[PDB]
C-alpha cells in the first residue's frame, strides 16, 4: 500500500544475489553448499512467496 507504483517493461539485465564471505573464508564451501541445498529443497521459492 498505497499500491501507487508499478513495474514497467522487462528487466534491463539478468543477475543474482549471493551470500558473501571474505576472500578465503572458512565458511565459503559450507555456505555455497547450503544455498544449493535450500535452492533444491524449494526453500528459496517458498521464502520469496
Amino acid at each position: 500500500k498505497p499500491c501507487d507504483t508499478m513495474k514497467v517493461g522487462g528487466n534491463l539485465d539478468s543477475k543474482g544475489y549471493g551470500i558473501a564471505t571474505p576472500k578465503g573464508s572458512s565458511l565459503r564451501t559450507p555456505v555455497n553448499l547450503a544455498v544449493l541445498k535450500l535452492s533444491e529443497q524449494g526453500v528459496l521459492d517458498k521464502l520469496k512467496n
Binding site: 514497467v8 517493461g9 522487462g10 528487466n11 539478468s14
Partner: protein, 47 residues
C-alpha cells in the same frame, strides 16, 4: 477542433511478442510437443 483531432489521429490488445512478455492478463502458450515449444525452451533472446 475535436473533430479535426479525431480525423487527424485516425489518419496516422497484443501487437508483438514483447507485448505478451511484458504482461500477464493474457495467457499464452504453444503446442505441448513441437518445434515451437523447443524454440522457446532454447531461445537465448531475452524476450
Amino acid at each position: 477542433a475535436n473533430l479535426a483531432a479525431f480525423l487527424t489521429v485516425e489518419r496516422m490488445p497484443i501487437e508483438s511478442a514483447e507485448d505478451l512478455s511484458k504482461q500477464t492478463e493474457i495467457a499464452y502458450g504453444t503446442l505441448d510437443s513441437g518445434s515451437t515449444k523447443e524454440f522457446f525452451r532454447r531461445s537465448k533472446i531475452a524476450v
